[model samples]
Target: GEWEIIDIGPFTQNLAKFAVDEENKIGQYGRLTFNKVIRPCMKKTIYENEGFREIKGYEYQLYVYASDKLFRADISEDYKTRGRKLLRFNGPVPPP
Candidate 1:
């Protein structure tokens, strides 16, 4: 996967507090936030770079704000079903 730097503003106390609250309410809220906000934006950039029409719809939008738990769970199950081949060549080896 390609890598890029994305500025998500300052990590203010309010944001930190919110993340703590979300983590307590759910789990891994920070990671979830990255998945929903940062990842999709990156994906969109890549999609545009490839000259593909932008993906649009409720599902795509949901991915933009999906909870970290849900995203992780879904991705985990998906990789399992695919025999974890998606990251075979990538380092850091994915969990089975």
Candidate 2:
């Protein structure tokens, strides 16, 4: 269970110069992040809790699927292997 994609994009546009100030180069100016009201919400979007994570040394990899989950598995040399392949978890999980 967790707070999901509450992104703060160019909601309000600031002057171009503000993006490069003396104290901050490539900085954020008046940005904001927001979350929906009833969102605690991972696993809440679950389908049969596929169980905890897995790992198989450096050859393995990491991935997540949402709607939601993360299951780690192995590779070859390691080749980008498959099966249970991925959670299909696309990210920037939006607010409820």
Cα deviation of 22, candidate 2, in Å: 52
lDDT of 2 by residue, 1-96 (tens): 121332222311111112112113222322222221122212212122346434321221212122132222112121134222221222334443
lDDT (10s digit) by residue, model 1, range 1-96: 233333333422223234333444444233333232222211112233345644221101111223333221111112223221111111122222
TM-score for each model: 0.23, 0.16
Report lDDT (CA) for all predictions: 0.26, 0.22
Please give the RMSD of candidate 2 to the true structure. Answer: 16.1
Q: Point to the candidate with the largest TM-score.
A: 1
Cα deviation of 52, candidate 2, in Å? 37
TM-score of 2: 0.16
Stretches off by above 4 angstroms in model 1 are: 1-3, 11-18, 27-50, 55-96
Worst 10 residues of 2 by lDDT: 11-20
Candidate 2 Cα errors over 4 Å, as ranges: 1-58, 78-96
Clashing pairs in 1: none
